[PDB]
Amino acid sequence: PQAKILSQAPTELELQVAQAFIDLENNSPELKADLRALQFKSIREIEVAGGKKALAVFVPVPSLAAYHKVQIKLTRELEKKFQDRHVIFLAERRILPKPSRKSRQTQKRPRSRTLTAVHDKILEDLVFPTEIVGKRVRYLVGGNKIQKILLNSKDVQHIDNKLESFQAVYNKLTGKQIVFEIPS
Amino acid sequence: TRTSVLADALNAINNAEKTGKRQVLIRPSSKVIIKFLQVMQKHGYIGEFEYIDDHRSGKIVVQLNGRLNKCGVISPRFNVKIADVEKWTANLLPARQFGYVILTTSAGIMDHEEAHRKHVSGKILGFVY
Amino acid sequence: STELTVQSERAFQKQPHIFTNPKAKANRKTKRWYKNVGLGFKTPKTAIEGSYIDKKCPFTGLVSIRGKILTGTVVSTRMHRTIVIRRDYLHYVPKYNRYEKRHKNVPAHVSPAFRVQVGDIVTVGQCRPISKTVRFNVLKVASATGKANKQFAKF
Amino acid sequence: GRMHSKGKGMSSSAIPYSRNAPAWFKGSSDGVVEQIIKYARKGLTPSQIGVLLRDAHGVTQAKVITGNKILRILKSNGLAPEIPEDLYFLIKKAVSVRKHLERNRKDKDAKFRLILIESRIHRLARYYRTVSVLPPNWKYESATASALVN
Amino acid sequence: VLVQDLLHPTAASEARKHKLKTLVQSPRSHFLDVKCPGCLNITTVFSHAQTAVTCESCSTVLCTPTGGKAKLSEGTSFRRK
Amino acid sequence: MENDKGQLVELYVPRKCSATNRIIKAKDHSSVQINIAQVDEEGRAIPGEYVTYALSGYIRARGEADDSLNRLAQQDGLLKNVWSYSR
RNA sequence: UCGGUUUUUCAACCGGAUCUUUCCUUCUGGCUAACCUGUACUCCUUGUGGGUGCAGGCGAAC
Ligand SMILES: [Zn+2]
């Protein structure tokens, strides 16, 4: 169960995560068999400005619903075992390039592998079972695109201690600056 | 039919500037409109502006500086041939000097000066003087 | 296009200066002469596997493609072994700085190396004057099906 | 601004900002699918099915809940009608109008309305031909239209 | 007029303005979670109807469709969402 | 503006309105200079030193001018609460 | 320096090469040019100052 639940398994961090998962399995009726049908493509470590660190756990995609079914509890448990650091369950998506006027036909691209769509999906996922209200995008006089993301006025506190971390993760992923917001 | 969208965007903006609104709401709002606005910004005609990601088509809120005078989009997108550019600028802009003709090219939606420097031109969209 | 029959005229027709020796043993019997037209075109197998003669074909005849190579939609198939391509283009009036959707019909002889249906785009080539109006040979009916195997909506 | 009158209405169904499922509203996807298929079997036409789902059951829009559309789902299960729903309805309306006209010889307004209906049908027919849902060179009008209806 | 910091207005203005003409459009129609005097079960029923709406299996009829918001059948308790 | 090697030309450098940035014209027989006094504790209204605005004729003519002035005040800290961002 | 001259201090400006979750139509062989190279190690300022050199292998230099 160590070098098995990892799709392709090289790194020590991955092994540690697997071990943690195994340890978690001690709960039994709700946090086993449901957790057995879950794999990590890989993990990416994102360093957040403020002492704390963030961990992006990549998931192959058809698994996402299952992960969501668990998630919150699982995340909490992971936080408990891997202290200080926050964990984001993320879905790895392919992002097929744009066809060029010259470049030979890639039997059409679906609007799923487009960059924008992928980024939107990441935003949906990276942010909790919180569900995004609206987006604004600011463009500032200098020339700095700043995504501004609106969050549900209910639940909330599941996100407060992570917002900066989330932002950092997003920046590392894409390059765009996210600001998170909640209305009154 | 809202046939052309850039046109619509500019018209409302123009109206706002004429009244002395500090802000406009643009209804449909494209890639093209955004690019145009960016171009305007780069030479400081428009302030901040915020594209609402409507889970639909779009919406742009603009901040006006009062530095706008008229922003026009020309009706068909006339394909324009590097020398034609000069003619257009003579016609469309208040001086041999300042303001910009905003022509779309293969290298992107630039103003006219930039296009000349880059040595590439294409179809015209708007202008800003 | 031709469509069946093979050897149905008042005369009886064969490829000229190309001859099948009755003396030699061959299961293939008839020797077909073909021509690789060139210009990056793949010469359709439905000539080499084919049985027709047809003097105005670019592959199995003395007609040879030089000069212009154009494209365009097929309007009309209504006459035998030839086609009417409609090469539609935009011509410019400077006085207004604007354009015309202009017509013009190219009649092109079609080798029966092709199955050409109304609406299909055709890479056609210029050649030796076939007849009266026809000065082009159909070279590539590039639209192979255009939803023909998958027309039905039900799963 | 309305295809046939001088009227310029903006009564319309709106849509919610979330493409995601509305959280608390339970059930599943499979159940929803089953319901849809049952409704299809019963002879209801897409819009009707959707309506049924929305009000009695825990449905907002099938796209939100299942992933795929209603029509798409129908196509997948092979239960969708041969002439598209809207078009079919239009045809029915036309038939009705024709019937009325048959009875009432002098009813100019009705005739005029029938003309408009026919025009609408033609437009729809054309677009179906273009997207290939009605097999090409099929025209829908007066004599055969009635036969088509049922 | 002149300046109206657009994107965030008051909830009252939003409530007043036509629910299509707002910023981010959201329906101002609810899901009545309705209880009947018969069985102890709740049904998720849209605030508008277009259908005479019976229960999960029972022929109770929850709501009669008027032009807009559904007028509920005499004495039936209902939650929200 | 400037004649090549420095040397400023173009005299009468237009007042711009503080509300609209629209140029206050030469015969703006409609526009105004608003002067508001910088103020201090017990009596004290500090003569000589004002926070000043110009309002162009056009806005005033339109009618919406008071609100603009309020806005200007709230920015330069001559008021608090009076005029809000959202209406 | 006997009105012109080029680098550093400096920018804007166009261009190219790139990795980023991102490929430029693809390989049969020519040709590999140089090192991803090391086979002996040293003429030599106490040494990554400097490469004549042949067996695994970068293709874009066409
Ligand atoms: Zn009930």
Short mmCIF file of C-alpha atoms in Angstrom, two decimals, chain A residues 6-182:
data_model
loop_
_atom_site.label_atom_id
_atom_site.label_comp_id
_atom_site.label_asym_id
_atom_site.label_seq_id
_atom_site.Cartn_x
_atom_site.Cartn_y
_atom_site.Cartn_z
CA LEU A 6 0.30 6.60 -6.59
CA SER A 7 -0.22 5.90 -10.36
CA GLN A 8 3.54 6.43 -10.98
CA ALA A 9 5.61 6.47 -7.74
CA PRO A 10 9.08 8.05 -7.31
CA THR A 11 9.29 10.80 -4.59
CA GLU A 12 9.65 10.53 -0.79
CA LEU A 13 6.87 13.06 -0.16
CA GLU A 14 4.52 10.82 -2.17
CA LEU A 15 5.52 7.83 -0.04
CA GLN A 16 4.89 9.86 3.12
CA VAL A 17 1.45 10.84 1.84
CA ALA A 18 0.67 7.19 1.07
CA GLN A 19 1.73 6.22 4.60
CA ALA A 20 -0.54 8.94 6.01
CA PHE A 21 -3.43 7.61 3.91
CA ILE A 22 -2.77 4.09 5.22
CA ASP A 23 -2.81 5.44 8.79
CA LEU A 24 -6.11 7.20 8.07
CA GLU A 25 -7.65 3.83 7.01
CA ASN A 26 -7.91 2.97 10.77
CA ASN A 27 -11.34 4.70 10.91
CA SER A 28 -12.97 1.88 8.80
CA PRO A 29 -16.65 2.23 7.69
CA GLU A 30 -16.49 5.72 6.08
CA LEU A 31 -12.71 6.21 5.62
CA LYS A 32 -11.79 2.86 4.01
CA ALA A 33 -12.71 1.18 0.66
CA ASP A 34 -13.89 4.67 -0.41
CA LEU A 35 -10.26 5.80 0.10
CA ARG A 36 -8.90 2.60 -1.53
CA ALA A 37 -10.38 3.64 -4.91
CA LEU A 38 -8.30 6.86 -4.95
CA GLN A 39 -4.89 7.64 -6.49
CA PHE A 40 -2.46 10.56 -6.52
CA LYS A 41 -0.94 11.35 -9.92
CA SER A 42 1.68 13.40 -8.03
CA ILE A 43 2.11 16.14 -5.40
CA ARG A 44 3.46 19.65 -5.94
CA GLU A 45 4.87 21.72 -3.07
CA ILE A 46 3.98 25.43 -3.24
CA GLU A 47 5.76 27.78 -0.82
CA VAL A 48 3.52 30.51 0.60
CA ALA A 49 4.84 33.91 1.74
CA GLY A 50 4.07 33.88 5.48
CA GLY A 51 5.89 30.88 7.01
CA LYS A 52 3.23 28.30 6.07
CA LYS A 53 3.38 25.96 3.05
CA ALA A 54 0.83 24.55 0.58
CA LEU A 55 0.55 21.09 -0.95
CA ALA A 56 -1.19 20.48 -4.27
CA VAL A 57 -2.30 16.87 -4.58
CA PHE A 58 -2.96 15.98 -8.24
CA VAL A 59 -5.79 13.61 -9.11
CA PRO A 60 -6.25 11.88 -12.56
CA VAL A 61 -9.87 13.32 -12.98
CA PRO A 62 -12.48 10.48 -13.15
CA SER A 63 -11.77 10.31 -9.42
CA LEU A 64 -12.80 13.89 -8.64
CA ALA A 65 -16.40 13.23 -7.63
CA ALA A 66 -15.29 10.49 -5.23
CA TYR A 67 -12.70 12.82 -3.71
CA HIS A 68 -15.31 15.52 -3.25
CA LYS A 69 -17.59 12.98 -1.54
CA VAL A 70 -14.83 12.70 1.14
CA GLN A 71 -12.56 15.82 0.89
CA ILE A 72 -13.26 18.00 3.95
CA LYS A 73 -12.73 15.35 6.61
CA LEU A 74 -9.79 13.94 4.65
CA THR A 75 -8.22 17.40 4.35
CA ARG A 76 -8.61 17.95 8.09
CA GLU A 77 -6.96 14.61 8.82
CA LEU A 78 -4.09 15.40 6.47
CA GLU A 79 -3.60 18.78 8.18
CA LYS A 80 -3.51 17.01 11.54
CA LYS A 81 -0.75 14.60 10.33
CA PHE A 82 1.15 17.09 8.12
CA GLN A 83 1.04 20.15 10.41
CA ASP A 84 1.49 23.87 9.48
CA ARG A 85 1.06 23.07 5.76
CA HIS A 86 -2.32 23.29 3.96
CA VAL A 87 -3.58 20.73 1.41
CA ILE A 88 -5.39 21.39 -1.88
CA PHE A 89 -6.97 18.50 -3.78
CA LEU A 90 -6.39 19.36 -7.41
CA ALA A 91 -7.36 17.69 -10.68
CA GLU A 92 -4.70 17.18 -13.36
CA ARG A 93 -6.08 18.22 -16.77
CA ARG A 94 -4.28 17.88 -20.12
CA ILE A 95 -4.56 21.42 -21.69
CA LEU A 96 -4.10 20.65 -25.36
CA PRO A 97 -2.47 23.57 -27.32
CA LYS A 98 -4.12 25.86 -29.89
CA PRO A 99 -4.01 24.69 -33.54
CA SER A 100 -1.85 27.01 -35.67
CA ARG A 101 -2.61 28.09 -39.27
CA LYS A 102 0.20 25.79 -40.43
CA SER A 103 0.28 23.04 -37.75
CA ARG A 104 -1.26 19.72 -38.81
CA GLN A 105 -4.77 18.89 -37.59
CA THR A 106 -5.09 17.34 -34.12
CA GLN A 107 -8.53 15.86 -35.01
CA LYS A 108 -10.18 18.92 -33.32
CA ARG A 109 -9.72 20.05 -29.74
CA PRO A 110 -12.59 19.86 -27.26
CA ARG A 111 -13.49 22.84 -25.07
CA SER A 112 -12.12 21.03 -22.05
CA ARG A 113 -8.48 21.02 -23.03
CA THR A 114 -8.49 24.78 -23.60
CA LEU A 115 -6.33 26.83 -21.26
CA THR A 116 -9.08 29.10 -19.99
CA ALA A 117 -11.42 26.21 -19.25
CA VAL A 118 -8.65 24.38 -17.39
CA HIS A 119 -7.90 27.43 -15.30
CA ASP A 120 -11.58 27.84 -14.46
CA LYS A 121 -11.75 24.19 -13.43
CA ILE A 122 -8.68 24.66 -11.22
CA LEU A 123 -10.31 27.65 -9.56
CA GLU A 124 -13.47 25.61 -8.95
CA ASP A 125 -11.48 22.72 -7.51
CA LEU A 126 -8.70 24.48 -5.56
CA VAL A 127 -11.40 26.42 -3.75
CA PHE A 128 -13.30 24.06 -1.39
CA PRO A 129 -16.76 22.65 -1.49
CA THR A 130 -17.46 26.42 -1.21
CA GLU A 131 -18.66 27.04 -4.80
CA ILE A 132 -17.68 30.30 -6.55
CA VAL A 133 -20.32 33.06 -6.74
CA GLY A 134 -19.00 35.52 -9.33
CA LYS A 135 -15.76 36.69 -10.82
CA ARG A 136 -14.53 40.10 -11.55
CA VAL A 137 -11.34 40.70 -13.47
CA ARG A 138 -9.54 43.94 -12.91
CA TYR A 139 -7.13 45.45 -15.42
CA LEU A 140 -5.13 48.22 -13.77
CA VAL A 141 -3.58 51.25 -15.49
CA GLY A 142 -0.08 49.71 -15.30
CA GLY A 143 -1.14 46.52 -17.10
CA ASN A 144 -1.77 43.96 -14.36
CA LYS A 145 -4.69 41.55 -14.77
CA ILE A 146 -6.07 40.71 -11.34
CA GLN A 147 -8.70 38.00 -11.06
CA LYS A 148 -11.13 38.69 -8.20
CA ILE A 149 -13.15 35.71 -6.99
CA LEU A 150 -16.41 35.92 -5.09
CA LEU A 151 -17.25 33.27 -2.48
CA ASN A 152 -20.47 32.04 -0.87
CA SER A 153 -21.50 34.04 2.22
CA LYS A 154 -22.34 30.74 3.97
CA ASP A 155 -19.86 28.10 5.29
CA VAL A 156 -16.86 30.52 4.88
CA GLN A 157 -14.52 29.67 7.85
CA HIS A 158 -13.36 26.47 6.08
CA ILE A 159 -11.43 28.89 3.82
CA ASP A 160 -10.23 31.81 6.04
CA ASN A 161 -6.87 30.41 7.22
CA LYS A 162 -6.08 29.23 3.65
CA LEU A 163 -6.95 32.20 1.38
CA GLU A 164 -3.42 33.57 1.06
CA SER A 165 -2.14 30.02 0.56
CA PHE A 166 -4.78 29.43 -2.12
CA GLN A 167 -3.72 32.63 -3.88
CA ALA A 168 -0.10 31.55 -3.80
CA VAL A 169 -0.99 28.13 -5.21
CA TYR A 170 -2.93 29.75 -8.04
CA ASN A 171 -0.05 32.08 -8.85
CA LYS A 172 2.39 29.18 -8.94
CA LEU A 173 0.07 27.24 -11.24
CA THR A 174 -0.86 29.93 -13.75
CA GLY A 175 0.71 33.36 -13.18
CA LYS A 176 -2.54 35.28 -12.70
CA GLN A 177 -3.12 37.08 -9.39
CA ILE A 178 -6.29 36.03 -7.61
CA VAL A 179 -7.87 37.99 -4.83
CA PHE A 180 -10.53 36.27 -2.79
CA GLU A 181 -13.65 38.14 -1.66
CA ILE A 182 -16.84 37.49 0.33
#
